Amino acid sequence: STGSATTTPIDSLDDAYITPVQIGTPAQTLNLDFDTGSSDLWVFSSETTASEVDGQTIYTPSKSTTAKLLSGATWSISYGDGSSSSGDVYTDTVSVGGLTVTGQAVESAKKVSSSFTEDSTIDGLLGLAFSTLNTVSPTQQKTFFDNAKASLDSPVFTADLGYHAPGTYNFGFIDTTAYTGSITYTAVSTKQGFWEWTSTGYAVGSGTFKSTSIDGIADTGTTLLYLPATVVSAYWAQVSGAKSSSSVGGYVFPCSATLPSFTFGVGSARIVIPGDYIDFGPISTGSSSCFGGIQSSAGIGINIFGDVALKAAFVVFNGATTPTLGFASK
């Protein structure tokens, strides 16, 4: 089997991407944030505290003839941006782009933090990291991909995120028309539960490539590119007037600037992020200070190849017995 679904930016900045997901019988379609940095499929629901729902589409398990309470199971998750959610668990039929999994754990939110309530465009998350990170207790549950894997034509999924435009998540096949050149594959460590890999270096604009190992994660659920402070300083030094602002929370730059590209290495291959991809717009409406798309990871503990980086590539998440990642230009 295969599946293919379009993923759409939630706003004009590409802060996140939403993909329609069919849950239950008859189908209830929710728009979920596919997140290769986490491993829970959770949804706003008829159980979510009413004051914490503001415009999201909810899953109502009592209206699904295939829903079953997973007795005794609870979940609770916190994300790198400080947001969180928690609740109980049903199993139900879940379909993405024509690919169907029966008995998928659908984690129903009883509580969500304010940032979720305040974002009416995201109805939940669909985790695509390794199932070792799934938070369901006392019986850990498998991700949608883990459940689908054995049925897929090939045990892979691909992320093809658009810049200010829709893109595609495919399951079970590589679309050889979706990229240019060749796909360069690179080793993955699953020891932290992430799609963790080592970039071979970087360049700023037309500058020379610096060969240096940068361990980080391929994370579709993180908006920006978070790299070591040395790398980030080297980038922003090429933008007149850019500076790190503690009050704003990162590097800002004059909105009048033209940003240089940023290149990262994948083995001997190179992925070029155009400068425009690094502009996240005014820090507040009407400001002439703009927020940068490359930020320091120093306070995180891990480097994160988020959407800024991934949207410059066609990315293969190869879930074979020994997982690997592939990157191609497009």
- What is the DSSP-derived secondary structure letter of residue 326? E
- What is the DSSP-derived secondary structure letter of residue 112? E
Can you name the residues that pair with 160 across neighbouring β-strands? Answer: 168
Measured distance between the N- and C-terminal CA atoms of the chain, rounded to whole angstroms? 25
Q: Return the CATH number of 175-330, one of 2.40.70.10, 2.40.10.220, 3.40.50.720, 1.10.10.10.
A: 2.40.70.10
- 3-state SS class at 108: strand
* φ, ψ dihedrals at 63, nearest 5°: -95, 0
Specify whether the CB–CB gap between 308 and 273 falls below 8 A: yes
Specify whether the CB–CB gap between 226 and 219 falls below 8 A: no
Amino acid letter, 284: S
Which residues does 219 contact at the CB level (< 8 Å), separation at least 6?
A: 35, 36, 37, 194, 195, 304, 305, 306, 310
* 5-174 and 175-330 have identical folds: yes
Mind giving me the DSSP string for 38-95? ---EEE-BTTS-GGG-SS---B-GGG-TT-EEEEEEEEEEE-TTS-EEEEEEEEEEEE
Which residues does 185 contact at the CB level (< 8 Å), separation at least 6?
A: 267, 316, 318, 324, 325, 326
Q: Return the CATH number of 5-174, one of 2.40.70.10, 1.10.10.60, 3.20.20.10, 3.50.50.60.
A: 2.40.70.10
For 328, the enclosing helix (H) or strand (E) is strand 324-328
Specify whether the CB–CB gap between 167 and 97 falls below 8 A: no
User: What are the residue numbers of the active site?
Assistant: 35, 199
- Look up residue 26 and give its two tokens: 């008859």
Per-domain residue ranges of the chain: 5-174, 175-330
Using alpha carbons, select from 250, 233, 226, 232 the residue that is nearest to residue 303.
226
Which residues does 82 contact at the CB level (< 8 Å), separation at least 6?
A: 113, 115
